Amino acid sequence: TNPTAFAQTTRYVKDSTEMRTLVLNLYRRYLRHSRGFVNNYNLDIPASQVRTKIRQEFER
Amino acid sequence: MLFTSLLLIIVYGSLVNKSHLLTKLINRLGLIIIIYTLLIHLNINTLENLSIGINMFNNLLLINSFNNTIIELILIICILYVLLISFNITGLSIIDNLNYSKRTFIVIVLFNIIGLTLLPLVNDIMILFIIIELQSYSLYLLTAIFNESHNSTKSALYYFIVGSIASFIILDATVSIYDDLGLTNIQYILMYIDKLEIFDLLCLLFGLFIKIGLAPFYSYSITIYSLSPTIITNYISLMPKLSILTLIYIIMHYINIVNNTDLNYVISFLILISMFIGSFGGLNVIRIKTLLAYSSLLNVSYMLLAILSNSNESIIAYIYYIIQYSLTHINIFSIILVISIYLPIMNNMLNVMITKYSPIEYINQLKNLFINNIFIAIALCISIFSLIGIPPLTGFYGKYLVLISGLNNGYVLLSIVLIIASSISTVYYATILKVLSFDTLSFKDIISNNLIINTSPENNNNEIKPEISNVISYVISSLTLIILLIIIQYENIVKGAYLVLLYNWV
Amino acid sequence: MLQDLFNNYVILVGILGLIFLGVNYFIVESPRMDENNGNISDYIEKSGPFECGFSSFNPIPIAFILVALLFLPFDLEVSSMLPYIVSIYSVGIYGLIIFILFLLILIVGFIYEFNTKSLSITTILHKKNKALVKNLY
Amino acid sequence: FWPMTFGLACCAVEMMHVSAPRYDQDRLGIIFRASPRQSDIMIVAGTVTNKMAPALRQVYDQMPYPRWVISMGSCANGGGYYHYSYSVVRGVDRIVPVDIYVPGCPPTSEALMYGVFQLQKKMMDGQTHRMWYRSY
Amino acid sequence: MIPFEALIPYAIMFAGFCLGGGVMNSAITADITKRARGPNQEIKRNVGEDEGPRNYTKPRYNTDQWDKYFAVRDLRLTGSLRGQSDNAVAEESFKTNSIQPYSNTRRPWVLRRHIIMKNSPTKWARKYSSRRDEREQEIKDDYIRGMGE
Amino acid sequence: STFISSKLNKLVFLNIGFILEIIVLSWLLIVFKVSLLKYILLLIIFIIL
Amino acid sequence: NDFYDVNDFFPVQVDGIESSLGKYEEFAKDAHEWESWNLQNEDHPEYPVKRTKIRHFTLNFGPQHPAAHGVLRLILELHGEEILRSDPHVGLLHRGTEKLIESKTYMQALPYFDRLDYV
Amino acid sequence: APLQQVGRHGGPNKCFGEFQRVVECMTNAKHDSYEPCNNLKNDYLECRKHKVERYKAFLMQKHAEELGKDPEEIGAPFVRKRRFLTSKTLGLVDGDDYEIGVEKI
Amino acid sequence: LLASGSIGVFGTVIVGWMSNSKYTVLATVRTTAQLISYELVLTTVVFIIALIVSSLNINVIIESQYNIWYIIPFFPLCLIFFISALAETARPPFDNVEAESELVSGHMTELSASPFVI
Amino acid sequence: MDLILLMLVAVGLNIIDIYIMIEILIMGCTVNTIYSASLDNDMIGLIYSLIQIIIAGVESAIGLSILVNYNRIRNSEEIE
Amino acid sequence: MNLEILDLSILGFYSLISSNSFESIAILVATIMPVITELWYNYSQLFALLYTLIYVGAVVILFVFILSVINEKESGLFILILVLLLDDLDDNESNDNDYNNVYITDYADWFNNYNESDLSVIGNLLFTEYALLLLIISFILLMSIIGLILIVKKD
Amino acid sequence: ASTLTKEDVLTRSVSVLRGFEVKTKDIDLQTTFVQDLGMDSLDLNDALVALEEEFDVVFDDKTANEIKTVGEVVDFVLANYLPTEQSINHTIR
Numbered sequence A: 001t002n003p004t005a006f007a008q009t010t011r012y013v014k015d016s017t018e019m020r021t022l023v024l025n026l027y028r029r030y031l032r033h034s035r036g037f038v039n040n041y042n043l044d045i046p047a048s049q050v051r052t053k054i055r056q057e058f059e060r
Numbered sequence B: 001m002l003f004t005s006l007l008l009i010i011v012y013g014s015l016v017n018k019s020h021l022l023t024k025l026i027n028r029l030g031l032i033i034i035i036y037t038l039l040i041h042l043n044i045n046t047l048e049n050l051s052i053g054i055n056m057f058n059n060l061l062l063i064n065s066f067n068n069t070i071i072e073l074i075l076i077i078c079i080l081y082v083l084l085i086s087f088n089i090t091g092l093s094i095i096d097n098l099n100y101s102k103r104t105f106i107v108i109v110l111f112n113i114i115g116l117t118l119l120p121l122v123n124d125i126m127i128l129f130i131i132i133e134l135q136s137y138s139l140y141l142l143t144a145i146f147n148e149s150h151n152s153t154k155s156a157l158y159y160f161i162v163g164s165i166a167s168f169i170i171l172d173a174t175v176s177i178y179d180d181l182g183l184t185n186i187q188y189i190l191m192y193i194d195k196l197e198i199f200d201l202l203c204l205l206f207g208l209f210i211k212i213g214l215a216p217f218y219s220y221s222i223t224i225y226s227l228s229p230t231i232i233t234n235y236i237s238l239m240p241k242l243s244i245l246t247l248i249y250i251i252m253h254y255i256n257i258v259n260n261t262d263l264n265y266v267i268s269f270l271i272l273i274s275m276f277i278g279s280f281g282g283l284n285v286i287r288i289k290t291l292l293a294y295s296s297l298l299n300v301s302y303m304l305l306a307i308l309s310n311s312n313e314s315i316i317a318y319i320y321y322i323i324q325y326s327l328t329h330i331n332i333f334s335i336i337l338v339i340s341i342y343l344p345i346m347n348n349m350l351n352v353m354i355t356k357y358s359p360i361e362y363i364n365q366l367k368n369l370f371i372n373n374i375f376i377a378i379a380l381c382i383s384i385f386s387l388i389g390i391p392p393l394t395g396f397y398g399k400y401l402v403l404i405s406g407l408n409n410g411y412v413l414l415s416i417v418l419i420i421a422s423s424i425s426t427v428y429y430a431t432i433l434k435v436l437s438f439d440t441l442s443f444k445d446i447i448s449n450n451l452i453i454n455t456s457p458e459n460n461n462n463e464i465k466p467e468i469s470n471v472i473s474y475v476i477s478s479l480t481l482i483i484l485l486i487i488i489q490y491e492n493i494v495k496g497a498y499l500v501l502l503y504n505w506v
Numbered sequence C: 001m002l003q004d005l006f007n008n009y010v011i012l013v014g015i016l017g018l019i020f021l022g023v024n025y026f027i028v029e030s031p032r033m034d035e036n037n038g039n040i041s042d043y044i045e046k047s048g049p050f051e052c053g054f055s056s057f058n059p060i061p062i063a064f065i066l067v068a069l070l071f072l073p074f075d076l077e078v079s080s081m082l083p084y085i086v087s088i089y090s091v092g093i094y095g096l097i098i099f100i101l102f103l104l105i106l107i108v109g110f111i112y113e114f115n116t117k118s119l120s121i122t123t124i125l126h127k128k129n130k131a132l133v134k135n136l137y
Numbered sequence D: 001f002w003p004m005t006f007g008l009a010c011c012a013v014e015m016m017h018v019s020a021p022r023y024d025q026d027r028l029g030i031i032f033r034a035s036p037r038q039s040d041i042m043i044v045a046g047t048v049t050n051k052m053a054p055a056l057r058q059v060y061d062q063m064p065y066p067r068w069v070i071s072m073g074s075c076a077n078g079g080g081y082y083h084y085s086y087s088v089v090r091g092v093d094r095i096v097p098v099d100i101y102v103p104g105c106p107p108t109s110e111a112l113m114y115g116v117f118q119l120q121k122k123m124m125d126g127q128t129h130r131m132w133y134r135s136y
Numbered sequence E: 001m002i003p004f005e006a007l008i009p010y011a012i013m014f015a016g017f018c019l020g021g022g023v024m025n026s027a028i029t030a031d032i033t034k035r036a037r038g039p040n041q042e043i044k045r046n047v048g049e050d051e052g053p054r055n056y057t058k059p060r061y062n063t064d065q066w067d068k069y070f071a072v073r074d075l076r077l078t079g080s081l082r083g084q085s086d087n088a089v090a091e092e093s094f095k096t097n098s099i100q101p102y103s104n105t106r107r108p109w110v111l112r113r114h115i116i117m118k119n120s121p122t123k124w125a126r127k128y129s130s131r132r133d134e135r136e137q138e139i140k141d142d143y144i145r146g147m148g149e
Numbered sequence F: 001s002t003f004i005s006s007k008l009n010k011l012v013f014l015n016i017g018f019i020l021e022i023i024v025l026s027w028l029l030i031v032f033k034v035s036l037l038k039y040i041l042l043l044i045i046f047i048i049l
Numbered sequence G: 001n002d003f004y005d006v007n008d009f010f011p012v013q014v015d016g017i018e019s020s021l022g023k024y025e026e027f028a029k030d031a032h033e034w035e036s037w038n039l040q041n042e043d044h045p046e047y048p049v050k051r052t053k054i055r056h057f058t059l060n061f062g063p064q065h066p067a068a069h070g071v072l073r074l075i076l077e078l079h080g081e082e083i084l085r086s087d088p089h090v091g092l093l094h095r096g097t098e099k100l101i102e103s104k105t106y107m108q109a110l111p112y113f114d115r116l117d118y119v
Numbered sequence H: 001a002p003l004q005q006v007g008r009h010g011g012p013n014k015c016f017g018e019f020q021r022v023v024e025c026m027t028n029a030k031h032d033s034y035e036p037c038n039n040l041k042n043d044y045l046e047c048r049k050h051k052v053e054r055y056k057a058f059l060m061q062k063h064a065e066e067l068g069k070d071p072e073e074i075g076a077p078f079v080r081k082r083r084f085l086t087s088k089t090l091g092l093v094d095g096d097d098y099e100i101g102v103e104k105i
Numbered sequence I: 001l002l003a004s005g006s007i008g009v010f011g012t013v014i015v016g017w018m019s020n021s022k023y024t025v026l027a028t029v030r031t032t033a034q035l036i037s038y039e040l041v042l043t044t045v046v047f048i049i050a051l052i053v054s055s056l057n058i059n060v061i062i063e064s065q066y067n068i069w070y071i072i073p074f075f076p077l078c079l080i081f082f083i084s085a086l087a088e089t090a091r092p093p094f095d096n097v098e099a100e101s102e103l104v105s106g107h108m109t110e111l112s113a114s115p116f117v118i
Numbered sequence J: 001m002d003l004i005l006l007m008l009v010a011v012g013l014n015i016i017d018i019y020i021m022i023e024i025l026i027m028g029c030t031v032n033t034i035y036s037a038s039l040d041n042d043m044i045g046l047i048y049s050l051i052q053i054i055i056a057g058v059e060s061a062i063g064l065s066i067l068v069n070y071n072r073i074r075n076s077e078e079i080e
Numbered sequence K: 001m002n003l004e005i006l007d008l009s010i011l012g013f014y015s016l017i018s019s020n021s022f023e024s025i026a027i028l029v030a031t032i033m034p035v036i037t038e039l040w041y042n043y044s045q046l047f048a049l050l051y052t053l054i055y056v057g058a059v060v061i062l063f064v065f066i067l068s069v070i071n072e073k074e075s076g077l078f079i080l081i082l083v084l085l086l087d088d089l090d091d092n093e094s095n096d097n098d099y100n101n102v103y104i105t106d107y108a109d110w111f112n113n114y115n116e117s118d119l120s121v122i123g124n125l126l127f128t129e130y131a132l133l134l135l136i137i138s139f140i141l142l143m144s145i146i147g148l149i150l151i152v153k154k155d
Numbered sequence L: 001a002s003t004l005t006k007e008d009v010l011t012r013s014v015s016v017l018r019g020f021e022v023k024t025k026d027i028d029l030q031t032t033f034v035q036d037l038g039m040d041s042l043d044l045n046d047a048l049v050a051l052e053e054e055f056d057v058v059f060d061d062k063t064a065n066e067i068k069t070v071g072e073v074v075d076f077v078l079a080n081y082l083p084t085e086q087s088i089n090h091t092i093r
Ligand SMILES: CCCCCCCCCCCCCCCCCC(=O)OC[C@H](COP(=O)(O)OCCN)OC(=O)CCCCCCCCCCCCCCCCC
Pocket: C017, I018, K007, K008, K010, K011, K014, K018, K022, K023, K025, K026, K027, K029, K030, K031, K033, K034
């Protein structure tokens, strides 16, 4: 058996600093696919707002 | 003997296991088949009997002493080519194993020799179209035999398209001839040689001119030759011209019966234009194969002047030239397949990407060959000096004999241009000699151990270890001394060409 | 042999084509009559693919390609047997021997593509098994 | 009367039994089709979950007119046994218009055929073209 | 236990073939026979009182080039492509009604109108070069140039 | 030679459209009367510039 | 990365590219037009080709299929026809029977089991 | 020697006779040159395309135009539709003008 | 008769080849080869019968069977003809084009109303 | 009109469109041969046409095979 | 009303505007059909059917077979009609006016009592007179079978 | 091939970097992101993807999680720009 696309192993991190690098890395990955999110999901808004609302949920 | 053995090789090759040793051994079976073919051909075919011309297979095929000369030549040059794929050209397993990666290589070559040898003999427009396709289809397959290569496949695609248009022009001329006369046999058309549109035979020539790479069609041939593997370019840039130029000579023999001047002016327009491009083109080039592609076009331009003139001295000029040019062509390409062992290895700038298909690709990869191997450098020097036309090599007598045929028929303008074009082309033959030797004395005492040849393993350190294989070395030496020492037996050879007849008789 | 009866048949079949298309266009109830929710154009939900319900977005085997490619040489072999059919008597033994030879050379091709197993799809990517070998020290 | 094979759960087992030899829906001209393009009847046979709900609407929209929808069994009708679940739609008539409701858990094969027979009686009562001449 | 309800569609498909065949066999035979009765419509329709039993002519198949020459030869004798007559002497109109069709010999429309098929090295010379046509026109001119002798 | 060879290098490039167009132009040499060759010789020399 | 992606032979050192009328750097500003002067071979294994990461043909063997005798969303990732990866998306018939049993006595929880395997 | 100009029935066609007479003259041994066979070559081309004879038809069409001769009275009667090869036209004694049957033979 | 049937083959593969539906466009490459492959077998069988009568006329073949029906000498060809006939019409067991369990309606999963009937 | 090379406007911008133009071009040659052969009542011209149709088919198959391998050569990552 | 002209004008209109490869393959089928139909009437019914059997049935469906493999991706009304009209004016393929304006006939004769189809004669000559042409063709077909497999087969 | 230049690309680097609100709106090669521009975690990474969108380029996590000076990005892009792949039909025709 093999994992599906864009999958990652589930590891419990033990260092605070290590997590933020993963957290920051993941943020661009959301941002990178933002135009494709609009195209694949046929969203009625430009990709700018898609990038806009992704950032807010991280800060929460 | 060729056809029967081809079926045995087709079946046998598809049975045994895919391996390099078996692939190389099957390539040595074909080398026998081509040798056996020559012994059977020379046994039954004689100059003294084929002089009249003999119809075969319901007059579809007509054979005479002029065609018979080229069939034996084609068989000979096909032996010297198969020696490359059948033995080692370098002996380094990395470079050589390309020649043995394909099992259908020798089969496709044997397909082409049947195509090449039958083309000069054709005597029917129905079989002219069939045979020209048998030769044309075999070249496309050989160009794409290395199907993994991106450049090779891109070249075969370019070759197929240009040849398809070339074959359509050939097919359309024959149809137009059939429309006017309703006859298919060439001999029956000769009865109406004065009653048909002689320019429809010229439309036939325009198709055969594409397949030999004559300007303005020269563009594709230069591109094709500079992309295929050097082993492939060694075959497809010489063999088609051997069998098509013989056919063009015969078609021009029939054409000059009515002696139409307009036909000669158009062909002179193409010969004149090709000399210009064949000479000025190669001045600014870096790739060696692109250089030999422009060199090939210029020599085809010379050989057409002998064809265009078409007299008794034109048979001698063509028969001699086509032989010496083939040996020179084989000798040069054989050396380029060998001297790749002296290439340096990096331990940078200009990022030159080399592949196993063309290890020698640029002219400056011939640098310092005077140092790494002096004996083979002179052999390349003698070969290039023949192409320049320096006497008393073979190349001089080709140009000298062509000039006789050209001027004897009043082609003064073309004779002078060919002598201008020869000197212009000497510039880029001299560059190959400049790269070979001119920087010898600065590099004379250098610490060279990064050559490709220095990655060869040391066997014993007591026995002598020759650097080049046996068979390829003997071929290079033999053809270098034949080029150099033709003066010794030139008189016999030329008198051996006076006898080759094309309905001269008396 | 007259074929004016055949021509009328071909013409009628040509007329029958226009009738099949247009009979649908004149008998279906007007979109307003049924539900009015839209024409096929604006109703992009109705004018779309079928993907069993869930919306989603040809590197075919080379064996399939060689099946289609080798169809062409084997078809020209079959179609060139046509002249022999309507002339089997008048060519006699001579044309029969030639016909058999015409078939033997093509069969040597059949042998070649039978030995290489060119049409087999094969499985080079998967179906692998291995031996578990201990590496004691 | 060509339905669409939209069986979801145990209600679909009784749907297949209608096509079995004993009842033989095909003898009445009923052929289950696997595509909306070739189907005009949607039979919701089983539980409609939240995750399945958007797909059900999409499949419904792809059926060319005229179309009718039958709700079979208690799950499709009003949730049924799973009415108080966090992942079940309490009645498929919250997603698509339903033309007739077949009651049971599961409805017997004859109960489903009674629902189909009832709908045909309604389809034969339509006046799509006399409506144009009179109501329009 | 043979199901008759299952075989009802086959008895209707059997009637489908019989319907088409029954019409074709009789209608074509009747038309061929009627037109082989005489050279005018007042003969074809009516049956004389002193005429005997009618001998129908079945439709003909598997013909060759002689049947195209026989058909026109029968047409010039009776007015029908499959007429019947066994008079040892033909009418005197037989010697002045031979039909010889004259038709043109021009290349197909596609060969001379297609945007691509008409382009060719020799088809341009036929269409735009006078070299061929001036040479042949000499032979036509010299036909009338030799009537003086 | 630097000027002439710099033009000729620009012509050798793998392109079906280029080679196909050159071939069809050469069919004009079969259509034009042969006395027009020198004008085609001058026209060619011009497009070098 | 996510959106795109980029030797068997001796590394051959070629230095001093020169033609008959001069050296490479003397015509390097014009060699962008001369395609026989391209030093970049297109067959070298190190040739950089920025090719997009086109996803494998992903068929949705979705619920509305006779094969799916329930509500199945089978996601098949295949090379050609031979299946590389398959991702079954179950849950389209999740009704939370396990959550509902906890609110009913043992006698009321029994009918929830006839409705697990219908057959 | 190979067969040329074979008819659609395996025999010599219309113009085979002319072509054969050309081959006899060209391959003959009593001829010094090809001049005597020049007329035979024209006949074979003439048999196939009738170019000289079509030209003669053009003058007779053009000469009648310049003299005013009525085409219907100098030309030959013709029928364009095969269905109207009626027995009145064919000259049969009691022939109608009703169309003939060219549907099925 | 063989030429007319091969035009219909071209008609079949065109249905899917103008469509973006994955199920409909699936049944073109497999549809194309299945009809291509069993066309050689159907064409050759017809030519063997035509070879026994030396005529490519339908009426002559039928009349040539007066004394014997070609099922007796050429029984294997009849099985081969019938097997090939099933594939050419895409009927089961050679049903993989329009397989309901595999590719739904095949090319017809995008066809409705008149295009379905025709 | 075609002396301005109009047929170049009529050929599409894909390698497969060139292949079709080659077939349509050769198709004109065969139609010309069938035209002459039937008028002359000569079957030798019909033998030529039969050969042209068969040879024009082999040319298509080889050209498509080269084009097919040309296509997969780019799509040759296959590292999945 | 020689309607064969109108079929090609439509065909000549769509050849100037075709963009994708779907329309390019359509021009092929739209060209054979006028070729077949104009051969069925007039000149040769035998070669109309040979073309359908060999071109449409064999080489045309191969094009659409590989188009699905290759890819499927990605003027002005005045100039087109102007070009088509200019293309329409001059349609005389030959300039022998008498050869194009004067009609001819042939005379039939009864000397051929062994009447058989053309395909009978073509087979009679191809399998006897030109048996070399037939045998080379099977040799060209043989090379293609080897040629296809070496080009395309991977391993 | 990459037909880009170091001076020209910075103009595309300058203009796209102008799309985020900064303390200093003037941009050069040495303009930093924390000091010369005053961007925090999220503002910087939005700029990086915006520059990625302009250059047909994708940063790696190693570089992208360490960038301080702009010139490295211009160094990154010129050293990591490749021609977009050409389809089979487009190449030769
Ligand atoms: C019985 C009738 C069968 C034909 C029905 C269709 C008739 C419509 C007219 C097309 C046929 C005319 C012949 C010339 C081919 C033209 C093909 C073409 O250019 O595309 C036509 C079609 C519709 O697209 P359109 O809007 O017209 O053009 C721009 C689209 N981007 O683009 C498409 O590809 C859509 C699907 C059409 C597929 C047709 C396949 C080619 C035709 C083969 C069947 C007919 C054979 C030719 C017979 C007539 C010859 C003149």
